[PDB]
Design a protein around this ligand. Sequence first.
Ligand SMILES: Cc1c[nH]c(=O)c2cccc(N)c12
Ligand SMILES: [Zn+2]
Length: 208
Amino acid sequence: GTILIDLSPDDKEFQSVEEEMQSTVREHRDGGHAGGIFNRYNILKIQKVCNKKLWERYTHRRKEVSEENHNHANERMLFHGSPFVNAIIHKGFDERHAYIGGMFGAGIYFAENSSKSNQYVYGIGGGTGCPVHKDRSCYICHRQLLFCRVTLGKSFLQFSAMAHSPPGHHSVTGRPSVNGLALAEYVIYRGEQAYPEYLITYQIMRPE
Ligand SMILES: Cc1c[nH]c(=O)c2cccc(N)c12
Ligand SMILES: [Zn+2]
């Protein structure tokens, strides 16, 4: 059901997605261990992910959440990094894309910082890095992230140093309370609360 439409670099939509990618890079407390050392990306391709069934599954759930939260879906665009991007774009998010050992429980995790999601492209903690070179800081191999539409509804705020949402909530927000430069991370517990809208293919760039 899924088709991928390549966006032109001249398209305003390509440019706005690239800017969110680039502008939300930060340094990480692991010195680059999980995701590599870089300050910016080389964006190689941005594709719009188009699947009618998956979209309608998303909007159906979005309406339910909205009606439970004074007509406010609390929809965000957030990054997701996974070695299972291909299953996600074809079959959608589900319990198999949950992070069982995550700090907010077994749910599906999303980041405001693209560089946070980049730490997960090759697995938890970056796995063993790229398939070809076993390098978590590989500057050659092509990486992919998803930029996703995510329904948060009423989000449980966790001040921060498949399962179920906290009762009376539709998601969890992990608010950073130590690292002043970190942006928030979010967890949903229903795969239908996210749609993988853009597939971004990129390399991390070696600092000059
Ligand atoms: C676990 C995980 C996977 N993919 C992500 O993009 C992500 C983003 C923020 C926090 C996480 N824990 C994750
Ligand atoms: Zn490599």
